[PDB]
Paper text:
Aerolysin is a major contributor to the pathogenicity of Aeromonas spp, which causes gastroenteritis, deep wound infections and sepsis in humans. It is a pore-forming toxin (PFT), which is secreted by the bacterium as a water-soluble protein, binds receptors on their target cell membrane and, following proteolytic activation, forms circular heptameric oligomers that insert into the plasma membrane thus permeabilizing it, potentially leading to cell death. Aerolysin belongs to the family of β-PFTs, meaning that the final pore spans the membrane in the form of a β-barrel and defines the aerolysin-like family of proteins that share a common structural motif3. Combined, these structures, consistent with the recent lysenin pore structure, describe the major steps involved in the pore-formation process by aerolysin: the transition from the monomer to the oligomer with the formation of two highly stable concentric β-barrels, the zipper-like formation of the β-barrel and the final piston-like puncturing of the lipid bilayer.
To verify that the quasipore conformation is indeed representative of the full pore conformation, we analysed the structure of wild-type aerolysin heptamers. If performed at sufficiently low aerolysin concentration, it allowed us to reduce aggregation and to obtain relatively well-dispersed individual pores in detergent micelles. Cryo-EM analysis led to a 7.9 Å resolution map of the wild-type pore. This resolution was sufficient to fit the quasipore model by rigid-body docking, demonstrating that it very closely corresponds the wild-type final pore density map. Most interestingly, the nine amino acids at the tip of each β-hairpins adopt a different conformation than in anthrax protective antigen and fold sideways in a rivet-like fashion, confirming our previous experimental conclusions. Similarly, to other transmembrane β-barrels, including the lysenin pore13, the position of two rings of aromatic residues spaced by 32 Å delineate the edge of the transmembrane regions (highlighted in Fig. 4a). The extended inner β-barrel of the pore is 87 Å long, spanning the entire length of the protein. Once in the membrane, each loop formed by nine amino acids at the tip of the inner β-barrel folds sideways and lies approximately parallel to the membrane plane, leading to a rivet-like anchoring.
Residue numbers in the entry:
A (entry chain C), B (entry chain D): 2 to 424
C (entry chain B): 266 to 318
The structure:
C-alpha cells in the first residue's frame, strides 16, 4: 500500500520505534522513497522504521539498517484519497462551430483563470505586474491568427525582464466522439454529378413454371502501383592476349576474355486499388420480362449535420517553463524552450490525470515531463484540486454544422416493370 | 456570447463605468474586437469596459487596462438575430431544360435586380448612368454565347471611364439532387445493339428423385495497364594494364578490369479492369431438361426522363470588384482582376451564407474573399436582408428531359421450357 | 539467379445489403475512416508469471 508524498513529512510529536501508537513503517514502502528523499529529509537528518531500522538523508549513501528515530507511522495509519473532487461535465451554450469554440476559448472562469493557475503551479513563468497567481495586471487575453490566445508585446516583463515573451494557449485541433443517439446528418444534396457508367439487363421468363431470379455482378477497379529498386553489380574480368596470330585468320591480335558477373538487388513497393462492386439480384417470382439498370457515378455530396454535444480537448503549453525559475529537482535549468504536454483527452502515456495518479503511486517508467510532486514542497498541494478539476473536466455544448468532403463515387440500382409474358 | 459589429457602435447617451444600467462589457468579447476596431473607434477615441478597464483606438498599441469611459453595454443587453428573413423556395413555371434555365436567367425580380444589388453592396463597380443601386440606365441584359448574361460594349462607362467593361453573370453548370419520389425515368429504347457473346447450358434430370439446381457463373474481364519507371545507373570501373605479355599467349596487351555497377529505380503505375460477371441459377425442382441462355451485349441506351423540380446554383462573379472603388480595409486596392466566389450551393468553405454567419461570429480562419462587415460602415446593413434572401433561396421548377449516355454493356438471361424427362 | 521476396496487403471490404421489401427509394451510405481509438477496461484478475534468475 504505497504511501503518498503529501503527508509523508515528519511527525514532530512522534517518537517512532519506542512506541508511536501508530501503524508500523515498513521496508517495502521505505525502498519506494528514494526518488523523493530530498523532499522529506535533511542532509544529515535521520528517520526510523518499525522493523528496528533507520533511513538517512541525502548526505549519506545509507542502506536500510539498524538505528532509532521517529518518522510517519501516523499518515500510513489513515491514508487520504488524493482524488479529483468532481468529474462533472461543463455545459456551455450551444451554437455553431465558430461560436462554440470561441466561447470555450473566451471563458475566464472555465478556461483562462484556471489554465493560467494550473500553469503557475506547474512551472510556467510570470510576466510583469501581478494580480493573484494567474493572469497578471498587464497580461491580457486576445486572439491569435490561429485562434489561439495571445497578448500584446509592448509591455514585456517576463520574469521581470524586458523581453517580449507572452503566454499563449493553443486551441486544439478538435476531435470528438459520441456515445449517444443525440446527433444526426440530414438529407444529402448533390452539388455536381458526372455519370461514369451504366449497365442494363433483363430476365425473360415466357414459360409458366420456371421462375427464377437474375444476378448482375459488377466490379470497377482502378489501382496505382509504385516501386523502387536498387541494384549493385560487380564485374570481374581477366583477360589474356597473344600476338602470334594464326596465319589464315587466327587474328593478329588474339584475345581470350572471361568475365564473371555478380549482381544483386533489393526493392520495395506497393499498390492500392479501390473497387466498386455492386451486386443486384431481383428474386422476381413472376412470369415476366424484367429490366434492371445499374449505375456508377461520381458526385459532390453535402449534408447538413445535427448538433453534437461532446468535444475532446488536446492541449500542450508554450515553452514558458524554461523561464520558470522554480526549484526543479528532476530537470536541470536550461535556457532553450520546451513545449510541455497538457493532454486532456485520453492518450494514456500523455494524459495529465494519469501522470497525477502515477506520481502518487510512484512508478519508474519512462517519463518526459515535469513531475507533480514538487508542488507539495513549493505550494503544499492543497485546495488546488478544484482548479485541476476545472481543467480536466469534460466540456460539451451542441454545435450544429455541415458534413462535406471531396467528390466521391456513388451508385444506384433501378428496377423496371415486370412485363407480363405469355407462351 | 459574441457581440455582432452591427449595433456595436458607440452609445452616445451612455456614461459607461459610472453606471449605465446595462449589462457589463467584458474582456472575453473585448479581445474579439481587434479586427474591426477601426469601424468602431477613432484613432484617439477611448472606450470602456465593466471590469474597470478601457480600450483605445487604432492610434495606440494599447492593451486592456484601467481607465474610465463609455461604450455599448446597451446592445449586449438585448442582442438581435442577424438572420435571413425567409428561406422559402421559389416556384418558377415548368418546362424543358432550355426554357426553364432561361426563365431563371431572365427573371428581373428573382435574378437580375437582386443579384446586381447584392453585387453593389459587395464591391462590384458601376457602369455609366444609373437608375437605383442596380442595373443602370445604359446597362442592359442580353445573352452571351455561353448562355451567360452580357451587355453591349459601345456605350462603356465603368466607374465613369470610357473602357469597354461590362458586368456578366454566369449560368452555372447545373447540378441537382432530389430527396423526393417526384421524378422518374421512362422505358428504355435501344438505338443500336451489337451482340458480344452468348453462352448456353442445361441441366438434365432423368431420374425421379434427385432434383437440384444448376449454376452458371460468368466473368468477362477486360483491363488496361499503364506504368513508367526511371532508372539511374552509375558505373565505376578501375582498370590496369601491363605490356609484358606472356610468351605463349598471355596477350601483348594484358589488361585486367574491374567494374562496379550500381543502379536504382523507382516507378509508379496502375491498371483498371472492369468485369461483367453474371450468375444464373435456376432452382428447378422438376424432373426435366432445362435450357438456359446467358447473353452479353453492347448497346446504345436512351430513356425519357420525368420532370424534376430541384436545381442547385453555383455562382462566381466577374472581376469587377477591382474597379470597385470602395473602402476595403481587408484588401489593398489592386488593378488586376479577381473573380469572386458567390457559391449558393452547399460547399462549406465556399458558401456565402456561411461566410455571412462567420463574419457575424468572428472567426480567424483562412479566408479568400471580401468580408461582409464593411457593409455596415458603408451602407448600414439594414433592409438588405430580403435582397440577400432573394439570391440565397432555393429555386425549383419541373424540367422534363432525356437521359442518355455513351454505349454501354448490357446482358440478359433466358430460361427454356423444362422438358419432361423419364427414366 | 535466385531470389526471394514477399508482399502483404490488407483489405477493408465491407458489404451492405438492405433487404428492403418496400416500394421505395432507399439511400445507403458506406464510409471508410481512420481514427484513434481508446477504451477503458474493466478489472481482470489473472496474470501469468515469467521468471529467469
Amino acid at each position: 500500500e504505497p504511501v503518498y508524498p503529501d503527508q509523508l513529512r515528519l511527525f514532530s510529536l512522534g517518537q517512532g520505534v519506542c512506541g508511536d501508537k501508530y501503524r508500523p513503517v515498513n521496508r517495502e514502502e521505505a525502498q519506494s522513497v528514494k526518488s523523493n528523499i530530498v523532499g522529506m529529509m535533511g542532509q544529515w537528518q535521520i528517520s526510523g522504521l518499525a522493523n528496528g531500522w533507520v533511513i538517512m538523508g541525502p548526505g549519506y549513501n545509507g542502506e536500510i539498517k539498524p538505528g532509532t528515530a521517529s518518522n510517519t507511522w501516523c499518515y500510513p495509519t489513515n491514508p487520504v484519497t488524493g482524488e479529483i473532487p468532481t468529474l462533472s461535465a461543463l455545459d456551455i451554450p450551444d451554437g455553431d462551430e465558430v461560436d462554440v469554440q470561441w466561447r470555450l476559448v473566451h471563458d475566464s472562469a472555465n478556461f483562462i483563470k484556471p489554465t493560467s493557475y494550473l500553469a503557475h503551479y506547474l512551472g510556467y513563468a510570470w510576466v510583469g505586474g501581478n494580480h493573484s497567481q494567474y493572469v497578471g495586471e498587464d497580461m491580457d487575453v486576445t486572439r491569435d491568427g490561429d485562434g489561439w490566445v495571445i497578448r500584446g508585446n509592448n509591455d514585456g516583463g517576463c520574469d521581470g525582464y524586458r523581453c517580449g515573451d507572452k503566454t499563449a494557449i493553443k486551441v486544439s485541433n478538435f476531435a470528438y466522439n459520441l456515445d449517444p443517439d443525440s446527433f444526426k446528418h440530414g438529407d444529402v444534396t448533390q452539388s455536381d454529378r458526372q455519370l461514369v457508367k451504366t449497365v442494363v439487363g433483363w430476365a425473360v421468363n415466357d414459360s409458366d413454371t420456371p421462375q427464377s431470379g437474375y444476378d448482375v455482378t459488377l466490379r470497377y477497379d482502378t489501382a496505382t502501383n509504385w516501386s523502387k529498386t536498387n541494384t549493385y553489380g560487380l564485374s570481374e574480368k581477366v583477360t589474356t592476349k597473344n600476338k602470334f596470330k594464326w596465319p589464315l585468320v587466327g587474328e593478329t591480335e588474339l584475345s581470350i576474355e572471361i568475365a564473371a558477373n555478380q549482381s544483386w538487388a533489393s526493392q520495395n513497393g506497393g499498390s492500392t486499388t479501390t473497387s466498386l462492386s455492386q451486386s443486384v439480384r431481383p428474386t422476381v417470382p413472376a412470369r415476366s420480362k424484367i429490366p434492371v439498370k445499374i449505375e456508377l457515378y461520381k458526385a459532390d455530396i453535402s449534408y447538413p449535420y445535427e448538433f453534437k454535444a461532446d468535444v475532446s480537448y488536446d492541449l500542450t503549453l508554450s515553452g514558458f517553463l524554461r523561464w520558470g525559475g522554480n526549484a526543479w529537482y528532476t530537470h536541470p535549468d536550461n535556457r532553450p524552450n520546451w513545449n510541455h504536454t497538457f493532454v486532456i483527452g485520453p492518450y494514456k502515456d500523455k494524459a495529465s490525470s494519469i501522470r497525477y495518479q502515477w506520481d502518487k503511486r510512484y512508478i519508474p517508467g519512462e517519463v518526459k515531463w515535469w513531475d507533480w510532486n514538487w508542488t507539495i514542497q513549493q505550494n503544499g498541494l492543497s485546495t488546488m484540486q478544484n482548479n485541476l478539476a476545472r481543467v480536466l473536466r469534460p466540456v460539451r455544448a451542441g454545435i450544429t454544422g455541415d458534413f462535406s468532403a471531396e467528390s466521391q463515387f456513388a451508385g444506384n440500382i433501378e428496377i423496371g416493370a415486370p412485363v407480363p409474358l405469355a407462351a
